[PDB]
Amino acid sequence: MAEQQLYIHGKFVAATSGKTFETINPATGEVLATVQAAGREDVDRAVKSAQQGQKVWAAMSAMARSRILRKAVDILRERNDELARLETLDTGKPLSETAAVDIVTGADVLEYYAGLIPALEGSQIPLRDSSFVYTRREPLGVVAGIGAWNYPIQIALWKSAPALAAGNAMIFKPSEVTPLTALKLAEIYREAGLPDGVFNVLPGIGAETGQYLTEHPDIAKISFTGGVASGKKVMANSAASSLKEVTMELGGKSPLIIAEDANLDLAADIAMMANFYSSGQVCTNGTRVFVPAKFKAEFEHKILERVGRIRAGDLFADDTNFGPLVSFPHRQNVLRYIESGKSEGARLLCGGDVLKGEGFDNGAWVAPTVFTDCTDDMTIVREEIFGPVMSILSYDDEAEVIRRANATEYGLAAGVVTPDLNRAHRIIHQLEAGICWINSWGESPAEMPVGGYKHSGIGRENGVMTLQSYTQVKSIQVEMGPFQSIF
Amino acid sequence: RMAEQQLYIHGKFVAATSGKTFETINPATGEVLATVQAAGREDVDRAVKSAQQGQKVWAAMSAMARSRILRKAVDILRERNDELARLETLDTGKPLSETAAVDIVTGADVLEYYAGLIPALEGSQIPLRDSSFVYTRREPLGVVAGIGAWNYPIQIALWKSAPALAAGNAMIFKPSEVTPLTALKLAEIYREAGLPDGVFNVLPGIGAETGQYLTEHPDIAKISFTGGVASGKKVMANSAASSLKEVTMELGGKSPLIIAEDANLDLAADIAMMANFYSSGQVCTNGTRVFVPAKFKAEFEHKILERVGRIRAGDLFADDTNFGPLVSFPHRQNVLRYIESGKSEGARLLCGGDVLKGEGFDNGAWVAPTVFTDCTDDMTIVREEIFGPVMSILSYDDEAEVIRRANATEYGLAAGVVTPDLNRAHRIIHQLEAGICWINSWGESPAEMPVGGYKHSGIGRENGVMTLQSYTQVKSIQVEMGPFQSIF
Amino acid sequence: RMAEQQLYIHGKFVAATSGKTFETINPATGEVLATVQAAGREDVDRAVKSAQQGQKVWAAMSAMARSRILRKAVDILRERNDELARLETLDTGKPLSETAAVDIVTGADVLEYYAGLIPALEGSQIPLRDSSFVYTRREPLGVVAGIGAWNYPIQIALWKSAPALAAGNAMIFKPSEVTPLTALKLAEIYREAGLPDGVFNVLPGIGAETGQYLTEHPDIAKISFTGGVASGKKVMANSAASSLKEVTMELGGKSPLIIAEDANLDLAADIAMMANFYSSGQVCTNGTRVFVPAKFKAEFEHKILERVGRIRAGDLFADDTNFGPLVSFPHRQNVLRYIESGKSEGARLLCGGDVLKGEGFDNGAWVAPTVFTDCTDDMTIVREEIFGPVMSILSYDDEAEVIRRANATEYGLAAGVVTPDLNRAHRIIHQLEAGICWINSWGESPAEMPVGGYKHSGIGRENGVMTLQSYTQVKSIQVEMGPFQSIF
Amino acid sequence: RMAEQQLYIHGKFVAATSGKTFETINPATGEVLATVQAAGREDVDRAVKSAQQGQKVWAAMSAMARSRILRKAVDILRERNDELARLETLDTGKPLSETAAVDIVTGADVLEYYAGLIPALEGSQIPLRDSSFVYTRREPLGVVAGIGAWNYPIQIALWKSAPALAAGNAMIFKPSEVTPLTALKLAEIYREAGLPDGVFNVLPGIGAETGQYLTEHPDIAKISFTGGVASGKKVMANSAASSLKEVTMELGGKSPLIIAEDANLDLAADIAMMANFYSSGQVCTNGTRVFVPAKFKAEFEHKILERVGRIRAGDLFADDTNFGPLVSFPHRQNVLRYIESGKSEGARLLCGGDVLKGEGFDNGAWVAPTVFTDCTDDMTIVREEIFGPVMSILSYDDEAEVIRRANATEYGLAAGVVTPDLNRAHRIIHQLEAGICWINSWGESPAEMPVGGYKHSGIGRENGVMTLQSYTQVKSIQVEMGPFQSIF
């Protein structure tokens, strides 16, 4: 394709860095496009543009903002198939996923927040007959989002929707792995009537462009999605440079707890969806599957049956439901984890190699992989792989499985499979995770706040509360009585 | 002298294992108030283990049981107000006329406020479809840490611990090395009210050691810090490099006080006095940039000087003393450095500008109430927080100009406007970039009112209902009662 | 004229089985606009059974599916704004300059507002102990009934149906017999937007029959009524005696407009004009008691006379017509009786007071805009709602006095104050006994702002987030996971 | 016989001027407990004027000052629990084992809950545009009236007065003529706690006279009524025909207990017992229609009979007694006519069905615990609320059917399901038309949990945060800072 540019103040503009990078189609190894990289001057230009756009945007009525975001939704729906194809080329996720999830649920969140703008309200507190307090929920101003590569456009929508709905301008940095759909979104927003500067997109390298965003003194908040290690670097710099509010959605090693009374067909289906969707590149994946020892062998058989139905192939084919990983460097990291599982004694139930033959030799494929006989000290059990690698762990009692599920620095998601009323709520209330599913996995409604305990995040996305977290409270006291000085 | 002060861990005083101690000074005399043990790394580990155990007991209690215990602590604080204030006056140098009327009174107000709200802490329920719904729990973070500042020691300890405890957490609190004594008394008061052991632990120590150990501990879920802007950046950084903690920060400001062209100048002068010289200027919210219309400036200066001349320094226990020494001699040196930069940069000194001298003052860390006028926005005393009794008077010509100048700063804590006009008061306040805004007053901080800073003056908020919620974390739970459909 | 108008039940027009009909007139010309079928007792029962079936389909859809449908209705209303406004002008006699700028615009604004809040309607979750918790659902009421008034026919239909439908209910709407035509158009618009059949049914009729059959029906869970204070007392009685229904009532008022001594009198006169002579005085919230300081009363009177001379009665479709006839000859007769009582009781007639005469006026029920002054609190025109273009000017001496007299009334709908002074505006407003309070303005009713009456002016509220919640009912659900203990 | 009981008006006992009195009986012995004066029409007006004066004092206080006064009342109630419980037992006939553990304890829990929420009662602020904003105030209604029922006299008086006082109102409370004594004690306790004179007045009397005078008075803004469905329709009607009052009603029910096919039948029998025979069946929320699968009906009947055998009637002050007489002898006659209607329609009497006889029973209004089985949906004992110790057992075949039959009633108060299955429990509860729903339990009513009826079982709710808000009225205030535009 054409050499992709930055998007600043409602037009494509050349980067003033003189630097570029390439994004690879993970199914072929070919270069998709050359992308310009925003430097320090590009960030300052984006910020000044955002400051000018934010004032226009905040001065509109709440319903005027609502209508513009809803027009963007209508465009996204109409262009769902077009945007999904570009997403498939950039990420390697099958079209069967991208046309059905990536833009649909991105738009859903934009649609949800568009409707809530008129309900964003402050408070009023009487103190006494002669004084009262009222609060305003004011825009932060200019905020920055740093996106991840697994759900490029959805992440762009989940960050920009609450930010814009709260009256801010956002500067969005997509992942260097997958920058292309973020730039389409910027065009769609302008077409919908978003004022220039309110959504600027700055492709680049995280070591450079992201750092320049976190360091800029006129950016009031950073929202980051990525791996735990990368988050720790981002969060520090947003302190050492200028005091920014922060939200982080990091990785996890989420547990899936199968109870003794669970149906094993349901449990196996839930476990399949918790591990192999998007080729296992999902932060909320239930990679640690805890199963009663009494049912281990049966559950293993049901997992192997379902793994055999997985259909890798042409990513634009209707029946394809498994794709390559996002890049060859990521595959190398995933294969190193698979080899550490072999060396540490875990039993390889299936997969564990790359895929071979016509149409796979040129892609970044890893076969769906399952380890069993896993113990809590193994590398594959303690660390996030971010690939299609399920770990099966046997357990004996409910107290044990709760301790083991919680004995981690990760805290993102968790789930339980049981038909019993008391067991479902009782187990879930004791798990240390922000996103808990009972008898399901992966559904993430716009209404539902999501985010991590412990090392898996700071703050939340989605829900009414995330709209509020993109505002800052101003408290105003009206003193109508006589003021008394003691001097 | 007081006896050597120990750490407070798991409902009792206990000796530090650091082998290190420090002294706190009475700033009015220079004398050593007490020797205080410093908590080392192993002491912090023991406090966290203690907090984890106590937190489980506390959170398993009913909401109303937690409420009643905090209300008992409020009753003891009200009963012991005078004794606590006298101790705070000894440790900080603030006049008893302040400490007995403000510090514990408004500290206990916030604990009392949160005690009543514990039963209203509620999650949500969201129906997705006939066969599925979501509900949320507002769960405790677990063990949280509070790091206090030295200017309002017991008020800060209450403002941090009250929402943390009311939300079901345990707090480990580290008082400032300058002012450790009242925090240890508060720990005893909480236990006497029935707080389970381990729920409020107190670790005196130095920022570079005890503070850093807390911000680095893997099993602490949140840090709440009050202090200077520079210290905040270091605290905020370690709380990420170690383990990904939630953070609240209340830092300094350079807050503007805008006097409008229709303001009564006696009211403006009274507000400006209270915005600058309470607690000897050692208040983060002080209105230290006073913007006055050019046509009123000379008359305003005259009113300020008349009021400055009423300021009564002296014995901190005397009823009519309303001005105290600064908290320490190193702090006074910093304040004097700023006063000297004001002189050398061409600001006009109208009064003060020197230490106080004579019997009763030579051994205290006293600085005279100081006013500069003819200040410009580039001067160091206008741009930087001084945390001493130093007012800067800036003239201005029109409303758009003063709004731009008020906002042209990295600080963002407080602001105020003096005007009897309805439209001007709201219109100006709405354009100021600050979290705490006062119309025709200054300084009042009701328990119900969230307070904190824009921009570099803070992260998060204190007080109000929202701060109780910020000491919980949300767990979303989806109940799927329909058949699950796998694509595989 | 137009074609015969039928009932709208279950997505289609359908003949009434009552056998009865009535005519709606054009109040500008006296000509029959249309013959309209009246809904009988069996027609209401059919409508309820339609509504019940539709409601289940509606409630089972996702929140965003409901939101998208109401937004499609909004878009249609924006597109047809001018045609619907012209029809409203024909049926009510209000000038097109009003109907095309306010009536549909602000009715659709409220529908748009509630469409977007549907996904935010949430219950709560309340932990009791480790072994038990409570969660709540905001469930639909089921079938609700709205009874409209004639002064703002489609705006009222939208302000009632929008939160009811957004909350998951079906609504049966009975428009006023004076003004049924736009409600029928709205029912068609809803179906065209995708509203399921039965979710909004429209039953024209007389109040004595169709209205009474709705209030008595046992499967209707809520009645929302807009109209006169007297008609309200009757509806509220039958909605308890027959079957216990939730009730919302928006009745009239005698709202005070308080002009302070510091007020600019041109602004005060403009506000008073807009508070009395819009929609030819046929507005429940009108500020018909104008309190003016004794010292400025004469000057204020001259300013009113000057503005009243500017009122332009004439062709209702002409752009510069800003004053219309009253809705009917019987209503004008009542306004004329109040005017005559003003003259007999000693009020001083400042202007107006008579029917309008001449070509173009002899066929409609026009009354000249009327102003009384030298009024006293005991006069009939001061004590009772007239619902016509009749302003009463009252003099006052002090602030406490005017607050007493503004509040000495069984009405409680609206109030306002004119003053540039910050303290005076909030101080006075906080003491007035009224649900809708305007400072330095009048009449604006944003979708976000709950509006409704104190005392005899109403029950409940319309608009705002709270009215969406009020069209749901709370179900509390306790999940007990511990072993239940019986004492038997 | 105690001394003739007087009215409680403005902080003191005062004689009625009505000249009328009534008597309250001990239902265990038939003895007269006391003569009680009845409030006349002039007495009601005096109470309203006292309440108007007190409310002004009370609302002028700070939120936390009101909180502390209500907390003092709570402390007195806890201290005086046993004395109050004994009096409640003498007046109502409920065993001391209940009154000492439930009546005052849960009443004081609700007062304690609302005491803590007073400071969190907030309005809203809504920006419209740069030049205008809205804020709301939650203002007191003023003077409100509570009408109490006889089954839980002091608990009801607290559940009505606690939100009403917490919201800044004054309440005039009329206890039930059957049980007037504890309400007079409550009034002295409130005054002893520091409640201002006039804020809580108690007017004993009859429903036809005193109750009606309260519902008619023009200066009472709200009525909250607890009673039977029939009397509620009368009360709600007069509160309209006279003055347009806000209304809350908690009426009776015919609540279903659904036992699932997978329920443990011992747990189900224990829940059914507690849902039918606590307080001798005189509980509006009782699960008096017990639905059991056909395949389990016989086994369940045996389990019910065994637990009925354990019921222990006797001395109401004995520790082991857990069943009492009905509240009055006229109420026993009504309950007996329902029992005879059950026999005459062919319901099978499983146990009970007669008065208790012998020494220590022949003087009390005792009815034996009674269970009917083989019951059908059309029987009188299944369709109508009995308010006595009469359980009806109904067989069913499938889930869809039992949901239809549970919902096929004009009542809507409570419901419950017994099932260990996650999907079945929520799925069923979500389809039941009742405001109060228990899963695997019955009867617990936390202060945090709103309670009230669907359909004919009530209007509005009690308890929860929402009920604090329902005793305020919303005032919307628009501040317009831009130039006002008149079209005239």
- Dihedrals phi, psi of A252, to nearest 5 degrees: -160, 175
**Partner-chain residue, chosen from C119, C423, C481, that has the shortest CB–CB distance to A446:** C119
Which amino acid is present at C314? G
Touching subunits of B (3+ CB pairs, under 8 Å) are A, C, D
**How does DSSP assign C236-283, residue by residue?**
HHHHHHSS--EEEEE-----EEEE-TTS-HHHHHHHHHHHHSGGGG--
Q: Identify which of B120, B430, B479 has the shortest CB distance to residue D465.
A: B120
| DSSP codes, C430-478 | HH---SEEEES------TTS-B--SGGGEES-BSHHHHHHHTEEEEEEE
Decide: A422 and A430 in contact? Cβ < 8 Å: no
- C47 in reach of chain D (CB within 8 A): no
DSSP string, C1-69: --PPB-EEETTEEE--SS--EEEEE-TTT--EEEEEEPP-HHHHHHHHHHHHHHHHHHHHS-HHHHHHH
In whole angstroms, what is the distance from residue A425 CA to residue A433 CA? 14
Could you identify the residue written with the tokens 């997109």?
A: A201
A63 Cβ neighbours under 8 A, 6+ residues apart? A117, A118, C109, C112, C113
**C121/chain B closest Cα distance in angstroms:** 8
Is residue C488 in some structural domain?
A: no
Active site residue B375: no
CA-to-CA distance for B37 and A192, rounded, in angstroms? 64
Identity of residue C379: M
Q: How far is it, in rounded angstroms, from Cα C445 to Cα B424? A: 24
- In angstroms, the CA C271 to CA A441 distance is 59
Q: Secondary structure of C290-354 in the HEC alphabet?
A: EEEEHHHHHHHHHHHHHHHCCCCECCCCCCCCCECCECCHHHHHHHHHHHHHHHHCCCEEEECCC
Q: Do residues D130 and D268 share a domain?
A: no
Look up residue B18 and give its two tokens. Answer: 């650091």
Q: In terms of domains, do C345 and C390 share one?
A: yes
Is the Cβ pair C438, D480 closer than 8 Å? yes
In a domain, A300, yes or no: yes
Contact B267, A483 (CB under 8 A): yes
Encoded tokens for D351: 């146990």
- Partner A contacted by D469 (CB < 8 A): no
Element (H, E) at A77: helix A62-78
**Residue A310, SS3?**
coil
Contacts of A316 (CB under 8 A, 6+ apart): A85, A88, A95
| Claim to verify: residue B405 and residue B460 sit in the same structural domain | no
Chain D residues near residue A61 by CB distance under 8 angstroms: 128-129
Q: At B246, which helix (H) or strand (E)?
A: strand B246-250
Say whether residue C116 is in contact with chain A using an 8 A CB cutoff.
yes
Using CB atoms, which residue from C277, C448, C474 is nearest to D450?
C474
Disruptive mutation site among A243, A257, A304 for chain B (greatest number of B CBs within 10 Å): A243
Distance CA D54, CA B273 (A): 39
Nearest Cα residue in chain C from D272: C486
Q: Which residues of B265-299 are buried (b: 16+ CB within 10 A; e: fewer)?
A: bebbbbbbbbbbbbbbbbbbbbbbbbbbbeebbee
| Sheet of strand A6-8, all strands in order from the earlier edge strand to the far edge | A11-13, A6-8, A199-201, A169-173, A142-146, A221-225, A245-249, A457-458
**Helices assigned H by DSSP within D80-175:** 81-92, 96-98, 104-117, 153-166
Host H or E run for residue D58: helix D41-60
A429 touches chain C (CB under 8 A): yes
Judged by DSSP in three states, A16 sits in coil
Interior angle at CA B92, CA B87 and CA B96, nearest 5:
60
Structure tokens at A475: 């408290």
Q: Are residues D384 and D364 in the same domain?
A: yes
Which residue from A47, A61, A455 is spatially nearest to A252, judged by alpha carbons?
A455
Answer whether A309 touches B (CB < 8 Å).
yes
Annotated catalytic sites of A, by residue? 159, 249, 283, 461
Residue A1: inside a domain, yes or no? Answer: no
In a domain, D406, yes or no: yes
The SS3 of residue D162 is helix
Of C233, C244, C484, the CB nearest to D270: C484
Closest chain A residue to the Cα of D262, Cα to Cα: A420
Dihedral sign of CA atoms A105, A111, A117, A120 in order: negative
C136 touches chain D (CB under 8 A): yes
Same domain, A49 and A117: yes
Helix, strand, or coil here: B210? Answer: helix
Contact B450 A456 (CB under 8 A): no
DSSP H or E run through B14: strand B12-14
Q: Is D486's CB within 8 Å of C134's CB?
A: no
- Active-site choice (C94, C98, C160, C245): C160
C-chain residues within 8 Å CB-CB of D456? Answer: 243-244
Tell me the C-alpha distance between B160 and B142, whole Å: 15
* Rounded Cα distance, A145 and A233, in Å: 15
List Cβ neighbours of A129 (8 Å cut-off, separation of 6 or more). C430, D60
The C-alpha atoms of residue B483 and residue C9 are separated, in whole angstroms, by: 37
In chain B, what residues touch C56 (CB-CB under 8 Å)? none
Q: How does DSSP classify residue C202?
A: E
DSSP B80: T
Is D130–A439 a contact, with Cβ atoms under 8 angstroms apart?
A: no
Count how many residues are written for chain D: 488
CB atoms within 10 A of CB C334: 14
In B278-328, which residue ranges form alpha helices assigned H by DSSP? 297-308
Give the three-state DSSP class for D337: helix
Burial A410-423 (b: 16+ CB within 10 A, else e): bbbbbbbbbbbbbb
**Would residue C481 count as lying in a domain?**
no
CATH number of the structural domain spanning residue B434: 3.40.309.10
Whether residues B224 and B293 share a domain: the answer is no
Q: Which of B312, B382, B374, B313 minimizes the C-alpha distance to B349?
A: B374
Using a CB–CB cutoff of 8 Å, tell me whether A229 touches chain B: no
**DSSP label at A389?**
E
Chain C CA closest to residue D238: C237
Nearest to C228 by CA among C258, C200, C207: C207
Q: Among all residues of chain D, which has the CA nearest to that of A476?
A: D125
CB-based contact, D126 to chain C, within 8 Å: yes
Asked whether residue A235 is domain-assigned, the answer is yes
**Count of all residues that appear for chain C in the document:** 488
Q: CB of D307 within 8 Å of any CB in chain C?
A: yes
Question: Cβ(C448)–Cβ(C146) under 8 Å?
Answer: no
Give the one of D134, D136, D311 whose C-beta lies nearest to C488's C-beta.
Answer: D311
> What is D193-218 written as a DSSP string?
HTPPTTSEEE----IIIIIHHHHH-T
Give the three-class secondary structure for D125: strand
Same domain membership, residue B207 and residue B122 = yes
Rounded to a whole number of angstroms, the distance from the CA of B276 to the nearest CA of chain A is 11
D131 in Cβ contact with D438 (< 8 Å): no
Contacts of C135 in chain B (CB under 8 A): 123, 125, 135
Probe site for chain D from A124, A132, A416 (most D CB atoms < 10 A): A124
Chain C residue whose CA is closest to B476: C125
What is the distance in angstroms between the Cα of C240 and the nearest Cα belonging to chain B?
A: 32
Q: How far is A192 from A113, CA to CA, in rounded Å?
A: 16
- Scored b (16 or more CB within 10 A) or e, B227-249 reads bebebbbbbbbbbbeebbbbbbb
The C-alpha angle with vertex D148 and arms to D146 and D151, in degrees rounded to 5, equals 160
Nearest to A233 by CA among A253, A208, A200, A204: A208
CB D48 within 8 A of CB D243: no
Contact D395, D292 (CB under 8 A): yes
Q: Sign of the CA dihedral B349, B352, B354, B358?
A: positive
Which chain A residues touch B280 with a CB distance below 8 Å?
none
Q: Give the helix/strand (H/E) hosting A201.
A: strand A199-201
Structural domain includes residue C483: no
Sheet of strand B7-9, all strands in order from the earlier edge strand to the far edge: B12-14, B7-9, B200-202, B170-174, B143-147, B222-226, B246-250, B458-459
Q: Do A460 and B454 touch (CB under 8 A)?
A: no
Burial of B223: CB neighbours in 10 Å, binned 0-12, 13-18, 19+: buried
Q: Name the residue facing B474 among A434, A445, A486 (closest C-beta).
A: A434
* CA–CA distance, C12 with C197 (Å, rounded to integer): 8
Beta bridge partners of D479: C439, D133
Q: Which subunits sit against A, judged by 3+ Cβ pairs under 8 A?
A: B, C, D
> In this structure, is residue B55 part of a structural domain?
yes
List the structure tokens of D9: 């008006």
Region of A459 please: left (phi>0), alpha (psi -120 to 50) or beta.
left
* Same structural domain, D188 and D44: yes
CB contact under 8 A, B122 and C126: yes
Q: Are strands A20-24 and A31-36 parallel, antiparallel or unpaired?
A: antiparallel
Active site residue B250: yes
Q: Cα–Cα distance between C39 and C19 in angstroms, integer?
A: 9
Asked if C322's CB is within 8 angstroms of D459's CB, the reply is no
Q: Does A419 touch chain D (CB under 8 A)?
A: yes
**CA separation for the pair C240, C235 (Å, rounded):** 9
Beta-bridge mates of residue D395: D292
Q: Residue D357 class from Cβ within 10 Å (0-12 exposed, 13-18 middle, 19+ buried)?
A: exposed
Which residues are registered as beta bridge partners of A13?
A: A6
Elucidation technique: X-ray
- Residues B49 and D435: their CA atoms lie apart, in Å, by 45
Residues D214 and D232: their CA atoms lie apart, in Å, by 14
- Both C151 and C207 in one domain: the answer is yes
Entry resolution in angstroms?
2.0
Joined together, the tokens standing for residue A479 give 């003193």
CA dist., res. D220 & res. D218, Å (int) = 6
B436 contacts A475? CB cut-off 8 A? yes
DSSP string, C83-134: HHHHHHHHHH---HHHIIIIIHHHHHHHHHHHHHHGGG--EEEEEEETTEEE
Structural domain ending residue among the three candidates B439, B460, B482: B439
CA-nearest of D60, D56, D43, D58 to D9 is D43
**CA–CA–CA angle B150, B151, B154 (5° rounding):** 75
Distance CA A361, CA B444 (A): 71
DSSP secondary structure string, C44-60?
HHHHHHHHHHHHHHHHH
Structural domain span for residue D27: 7-252+449-474
Question: B85 near B96, Cβ under 8 Å?
Answer: yes
- Cβ neighbours around C294 below 10 Å, total: 12
Among the partner residues C125, C128, C419, nearest to B136 by beta-carbon distance: C125
Those of residues 267-286 in B touching chain A at CB distance below 8 A are 267, 270-271, 273-274, 277-278
DSSP E strands, D141-278: 143-147, 170-174, 200-202, 222-226, 246-250, 256-259
Give the tokens for residue A309. 């139905």
Q: Identify the CA nearest to D236 among candidates D206, D216, D219.
A: D216
The Cα–Cα gap between B311 and B305 comes to: 10
Do A320 and A357 reside in the same domain of the chain?
yes
Number of structural domains, chain A? 2
C293 and C246 belong to one structural domain: no
CA distance linking residue D16 with residue D9, whole number of Å: 10
Residues contacting C90, CB < 8 A, separation 6+: C26, C28, C33, C181
Min Cα–Cα distance to chain C from A480, Å: 5
- CATH code for the domain of A69: 3.40.605.10
Query: Do residues D113 and D233 both lie within one domain?
Result: yes
Q: What are B223's strand-pairing partners?
A: B145, B247
Residues of D in contact with A62 (CB under 8 A): 127
Residue from C88, C112, C177, C250 carrying the catalytic annotation: C250
Contact status of C359 with chain A (Cβ, < 8 Å) = no
Cβ-Cβ contacts under 8 Å, C134 against chain B: none
Q: Which residues of D are catalytic?
A: 160, 250, 284, 462
Chain B, chain D: beta-carbon pairs less than 8 Å apart: 61
Contacts of C128 in chain B (CB under 8 A): 62
Among B129, A447, A425, which residue's Cα sits nearest to residue D430? B129
Q: How far is C-alpha D316 from the chain's CA centre?
A: 22
Q: Would you tell me how many other CB atoms lie within 10 Å of the CB of residue A67?
A: 19
Rounded Cα gap, residues D70 and D118, in angstroms: 10
